Ligand binder design. Sequence first.
Ligand SMILES: CC(=O)SCCNC(=O)CCNC(=O)[C@H](O)C(C)(C)COP(=O)(O)OP(=O)(O)OC[C@H]1O[C@@H](n2cnc3c(N)ncnc32)[C@H](O)[C@@H]1OP(=O)(O)O
Ligand SMILES: NC(=[NH2+])NCCC[C@H](N)C(=O)O
Ligand SMILES: NC(=[NH2+])NCCC[C@H](N)C(=O)O
Lengths: 166, 168
Amino acid sequence: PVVRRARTSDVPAIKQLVDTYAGKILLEKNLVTLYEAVQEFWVAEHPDLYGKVVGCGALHVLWSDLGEIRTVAVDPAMTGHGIGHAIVDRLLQVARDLQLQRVFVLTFETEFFARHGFTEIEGTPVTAEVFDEMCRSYDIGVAEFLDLSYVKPNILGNSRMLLVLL
Amino acid sequence: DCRPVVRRARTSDVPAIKQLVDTYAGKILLEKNLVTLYEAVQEFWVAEHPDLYGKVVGCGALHVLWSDLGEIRTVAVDPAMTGHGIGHAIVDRLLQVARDLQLQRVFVLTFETEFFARHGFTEIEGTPVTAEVFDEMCRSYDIGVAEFLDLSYVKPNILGNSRMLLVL
Ligand SMILES: CC(=O)SCCNC(=O)CCNC(=O)[C@H](O)C(C)(C)COP(=O)(O)OP(=O)(O)OC[C@H]1O[C@@H](n2cnc3c(N)ncnc32)[C@H](O)[C@@H]1OP(=O)(O)O
Ligand SMILES: NC(=[NH2+])NCCC[C@H](N)C(=O)O
Ligand SMILES: NC(=[NH2+])NCCC[C@H](N)C(=O)O
């Protein structure tokens, strides 16, 4: 499937994908914060219909060398057609374009991301000096990566996976 | 005089960007710590130094605020390189990406009224969004959005600044 960069017109559709997977699975993102993050988002168009989008995804930078894959959602009726994998394949390519070395994921979909080289891990792989700089973030997804105390109850059960690049 | 290359930022550029933002502190620019610069690297732009290959002498960023609305934020140039056309080369680029995003209006909160005027910006009053959108935008964790909404707790941090806007 075609994986293209998101457009402000795509936000209402993107919002519906995130809301579909609610807050237990995906981290909720309100309408404004999606319009602000539109420049790092990607969407998969339906293989036949030109306009409609069936999947979204975003690469979030966390530091000099570290990136994250977040807010990956596919229409419940379109899963198992390779869409989600087509999104990750491109998201990882832009991670390369960004000269990143490690890509993080916090998810229940261990099997899904495993097919891209992701291995499950424990802890936060950053220096305490770097850890201290990231505590200063206003972004919740960063806090879930740092396993900060005030987001812990929202992410128990999720697995921490990581990918290294050539 | 030379028009400098204005390219997308790279994670290696963030430390340099951090010194430019820090240079203009909180009196002029809204301060941005190191992590939020690495997170925003995909919307940031930098002007390369006409002489040093790696180092950057100016930065700038376009932040989308809604379907049609964008903002230009954290635009800074080295004090020793000011008045050499860099900042306008950055703004010219930021506005081009606003078009590629199919935006219609671009907002600015600044003291540099004449600077942005050279691009067609006109001064305004208030927050130009529907009250329905205003309510959706109140939910943001970004301080720059709160300053666009003229929220009460940031008022003392922006007193004196002018609100300008550009239409495409
Ligand atoms: C974040 C926001 O949204 S607010 C943005 C404002 N930020 C700030 O003011 C931070 C403090 N100020 C600054 O950092 C700087 O003033 C900047 C980065 C905004 C602009 O700096 P520079 O680009 O280097 O100055 P620049 O070379 O573009 O020209 C400044 C003036 O001199 C003129 N100009 C003078 N000489 C030249 C020249 N050789 N070439 C091109 N333009 C020139 C410009 O036309 C311009 O006139 P204008 O203000 O009426 O448009
Ligand atoms: N708040 C949560 N339920 N978080 C679980 C992990 C969310 C995941 N990191 C994402 O991309 O959305
Ligand atoms: N210190 C402030 N918040 N000043 C108000 C203007 C902020 C400026 N537009 C910026 O992007 O940084």
